[PDB]
Design a protein around this nucleic acid. Structure first.
Ligand code: DCP
Ligand SMILES: OC[C@H]1O[C@@](CO)(O[C@H]2O[C@H](CO)[C@@H](O)[C@H](O)[C@H]2O)[C@@H](O)[C@@H]1O
Ligand SMILES: OC[C@H]1O[C@@](CO)(O[C@H]2O[C@H](CO)[C@@H](O)[C@H](O)[C@H]2O)[C@@H](O)[C@@H]1O
Ligand code: MG
Length: 580
DNA sequence: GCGATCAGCCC
DNA sequence: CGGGCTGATCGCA
C-alpha cells in the first residue's frame, strides 16, 4: 500500500513544526560538496516531500534547519550536516540519529541504511537504499515519484522508530552514550571533515618523481637478478621466479599459492640478492601507489585540501575509521614513508600543526579494569612499561634488560591486549608455541590481576552474551559458546580485547567533546583536524601554541578518571612531519 | 566493468 | 594473538 504524502511545490508553516523526522538525501557515497537530491519531512501535521532547490532557497526553511529549538530525528545526520555546510547552511537541533542508535545497540548488524535499522524492530515498510538507487555503475537517482516515496518512507520509519530505539538504549543504559557522546561527536566530526587538511601537492609531486626514479632502478636490478622481466606486483609471477626459477625455500604458503609477504621474504634474503631488492621495491611501490598517487587523486584542485569521511558507525569496538582518503594510516614507522607527512601542512599562513597522543592508553585502561596491583603501580610510577614487563617475566633488574628482551616483552604486552594466544604470539616473535606459552604463563604470574580479569571477562561474556566498555558501549559475542575451538577462541580474545580497545575509544571521544568546548570557551582559533585512535591532530595560529601545550594534554588527561593517571605527550611544527 | 586474494600501511 | 582502508593482479563476466 502506497504511503500518503504531500509533494509540495512550496514550504509551509506546517512543515516547520518543532519536532520532526528529517531526510536530506545525499546519494553520492562521498558527500563532500555533493548534491542533495531531495528532502522529506514527517511531523505531527503529516508527511512532506520538498525539492532541494525550493526548500534550500526558502528563508523560513533554512532558518528552521538552523534553529536548535526545532528538534529533528534523522539517519546519518553527519552526512546531511556536511553536505549542507558546503552549501553554507547550518543544521542544528538534531536530537536523534537512528544510524548511531542502531550502531550502539549492535555494531555487528552492520546497519548502513534506514531499512536495516528498521528491520531490527520488525518494521519493513521501507526499501533498502541499494534497491532504490542500485549499485556500482548502475547506481542512479530514480524519477521523482519513486524518489519522493522512498524519502518519505525513510522519514516515516525514523519518526516511528525513535521511541523504540531510545527505549532499548535506556534499558541497556546506553542512552547517555548516544545523547551525550556519539551525537555531539558527530557534529565535531562534521566540522573536522569540512575543514579538511591542506596538502602541499608540489611536495608530493616531487616525491613521486624521485620515487619513480628509484623504482625504475630497483625494478631493472630485479629483472637483472632474475634473469628476465616479469610483473613484480604479481605474487603469482613473483612466486614462480622465487620458488621455481631461483629455487628459494618455501617457508610458508597461501591458500592459493606461494606466500611472498615481507615476513617471509625477510627470512629468504640470505639466499639471494633479489629478495632485498623485492622488499625495497615493495616499500617504494607502496608509497608511490597508495600515498603519492592515492592522495593526489582525492586532493581538491581548488583548495588543495583533502576531506576525509570518518565512519562513526562501523568498527566493532567503537573506534572511528577514515576513508577517501584514509588519514589514519599515513606512514610514520620508516623514515622514507614518514617524509610523506611533510606534505600535510597548516591551512593558513603562520599556523602550525599540533599533535597530542595518549601514552599507553590501552595498558592503562587494562590496569584500571583489571585492578592489577603490579600494573597499576607501574603506571603510577610512570615506568617504561615494556622494560618493566621484561624485568618481571624474565626475572632481571632494570639494568639487565637487553634490547631483545624489551622487544619481546613489548610483543607480549600487545598480545595481552589483543587477547593473548600462544600460537599468535609465537608467529609474531618467530618462535614456537611452547616457548610463547612460557612467556604468557610468566606474564600472568607477574600480573595476577590481569589473569583474573581475562578469566572473569570471558565468563561474563558467556553469561551475559556480550561485553561492555567504560561508557557502556556493547559488543555481542555469540561465538563465545561455539564448540569449535578456533571460532570460540576468537570470540574469547574479542571478549578480552573489546573492553580495552573500546574503553580507549570512549575516552578519546569524550576528550574530543571536552576539548571543543574548552577551545570555544577560550575563543581560540585552534581546531581539530584528525583523530588517529589515541591521538588528536589540530592546527592553530603559531601564537596559540603555548596555550595549547597546556590545554590539550590537560583536557585529554582529564576526560575520565581512572585508578591510574592518563598521560598525554605532544609536539608541534610547520608540518605534520615536524609535529614530532 | 565486479569481487576474491594478497599485500602493507596505521594504532 | 585485536581493530581498520586501499591498491595491485586476475579469474569471470
Ligand atoms: N543511562 C545511562 C547510564 C550510563 N551510560 C553510560 C555513559 C556514562 O558516562 C557511563 C557511566 O554511567 P554512570 O556514571 O551512571 O555509572 P553506572 O552508575 O552506570 O556504573 P557502571 O558504569 O559501572 O554501570 O555509562 C549511558 O549511556 N546511559
Ligand atoms: O555517511 C557515512 C555513513 O554512511 C554509511 C552508510 O550508511 O557509509 C557510506 O558512506 C561512506 C563514506 O563515503 C562509505 O565508505 C560507505 O561505503 C557508504 O556505504 C555508514 O557506514 C557511515 O556511517
Ligand atoms: O580454566 C579454564 C580456562 O580456559 C578458558 C580458555 O583459555 O575457558 C575454557 O573453560 C571455561 C570453563 O572454566 C569455559 O567457560 C570456556 O568456554 C572454555 O573455553 C579460560 O577462560 C579459563 O580460565
Ligand atoms: Mg601513543
Amino acid at each position: 500500500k502506497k504511503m500518503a504524502f504531500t509533494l509540495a511545490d512550496r514550504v509551509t508553516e506546517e512543515m516547520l513544526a518543532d519536532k520532526a523526522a528529517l531526510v536530506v538525501e545525499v546519494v553520492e557515497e562521498n558527500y563532500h560538496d555533493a548534491p542533495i537530491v531531495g528532502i522529506a519531512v514527517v511531523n505531527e501535521h503529516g508527511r512532506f516531500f520538498l525539492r532541494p532547490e525550493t526548500a534550500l532557497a526558502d528563508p523560513q526553511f533554512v532558518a528552521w534547519l538552523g534553529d536548535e529549538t526545532k528538534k529533528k530525528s534523522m539517519f546519518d545526520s553527519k552526512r546531511a550536516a556536511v553536505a549542507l555546510k558546503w552549501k553554507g547552511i547550518e543544521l542544528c537541533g538534531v536530537s536523534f540519529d537512528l544510524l548511531l542508535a542502531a550502531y550502539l545497540l549492535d555494531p555487528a548488524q552492520g546497519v548502513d541504511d534506514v531499512a536495516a535499522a528498521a528491520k531490527m524492530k520488525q518494521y519493513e515498510a521501507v526499501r533498502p537504499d541499494e534497491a532504490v538507487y542500485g549499485k556500482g555503475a548502475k547506481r542512479a537517482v530514480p524519477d521523482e515519484p519513486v524518489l519522493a516515496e522512498h524519502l518519505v518512507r525513510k522519514a516515516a520509519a525514523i519518526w516511528e522508530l525513535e521511541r523504540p530505539f531510545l527505549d532499548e538504549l535506556r534499558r541497556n543504559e546506553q542512552d547517555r552514550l548516544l545523547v551525550e557522546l556519539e551525537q555531539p561527536l558527530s557534529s565535531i566530526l562534521a566540522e573536522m571533515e569540512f575543514a579538511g587538511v591542506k596538502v602541499d601537492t608540489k611536495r608530493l609531486e616531487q616525491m613521486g618523481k624521485e620515487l619513480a626514479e628509484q623504482l625504475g632502478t630497483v625494478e631493472q636490478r630485479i629483472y637483472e637478478l632474475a634473469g628476465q622481466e616479469f610483473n613484480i606486483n604479481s605474487p603469482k609471477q613473483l612466486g614462480v621466479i622465487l620458488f621455481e626459477k631461483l629455487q628459494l625455500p618455501v617457508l610458508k604458503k597461501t591458500k592459493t599459492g606461494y606466500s611472498t609477504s615481507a615476513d617471509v621474504l625477510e627470512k629468504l634474503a640470505p639466499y639471494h640478492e633479489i629478495v632485498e631488492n623485492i622488499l625495497h621495491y615493495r616499500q617504494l611501490g607502496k608509497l608511490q601507489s597508495t600515498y603519492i598517487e592515492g592522495l593526489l587523486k582525492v586532493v581538491r584542485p581548488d583548495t588543495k585540501k583533502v576531506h576525509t569521511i570518518f565512519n562513526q558507525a562501523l568498527t566493532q569496538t567503537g573506534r572511528l575509521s577514515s576513508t577517501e582518503p584514509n588519514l589514519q594510516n599515513i606512514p610514520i614507522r620508516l623514515e622514507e614513508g614518514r617524509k610523506i607527512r611533510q606534505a600535510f601542512v597548516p591551512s593558513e599562513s603562520d599556523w602550525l600543526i599540533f599533535a597530542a597522543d595518549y601514552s599507553q592508553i590501552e595498558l592503562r585502561v587494562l590496569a584500571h579494569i583489571a585492578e592489577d596491583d603490579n600494573l597499576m603501580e607501574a603506571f603510577r610510577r610512570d615506568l617504561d612499561i615494556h622494560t618493566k614487563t621484561a624485568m618481571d617475566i624474565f626475572q632481571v633488574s632494570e639494568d639487565e634488560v637487553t634490547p631483545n628482551m624489551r622487544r619481546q616483552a613489548k610483543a607480549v604486552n600487545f598480545g595481552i591486549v589483543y587477547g593473548i594466544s600462544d600460537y599468535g604470539l609465537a608467529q609474531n616473535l618467530n618462535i614456537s608455541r611452547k616457548e610463547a606459552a612460557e612467556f604468557i604463563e610468566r606474564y600472568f604470574e607477574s600480573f595476577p590481576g590481569v589473569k583474573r580479569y581475562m578469566e572473569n571477562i570471558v565468563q561474563e561474556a558467556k553469561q551475559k552474551g556480550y561485553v561492555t566498555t567504560l561508557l557502556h558501549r556493547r559488543r555481542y559475542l555469540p561465538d563465545i559458546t561455539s564448540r569449535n575451538f578456533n571460532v570460540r577462541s576468537f570470540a574469547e580474545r574479542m571478549a578480552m580485547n573489546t573492553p580495552i580497545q573500546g574503553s580507549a575509544a570512549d575516552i578519546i571521544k569524550k576528550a574530543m567533546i571536552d576539548l571543543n568546548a574548552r577551545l570555544k570557551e577560550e575563543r581560540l582559533q585552534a581546531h581539530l583536524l584528525l583523530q588517529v585512535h589515541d591521538e588528536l591532530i589540530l592546527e592553530a595560529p603559531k601564537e596559540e601554541m603555548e596555550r595549547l601545550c597546556r590545554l590539550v594534554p590537560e583536557v585529554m588527561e582529564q576526560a575520565v578518571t581512572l585508578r591510574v593517571p592518563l598521560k598525554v605527550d605532544y609536539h608541534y611544527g610547520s608540518t605534520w612531519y615536524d609535529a614530532k
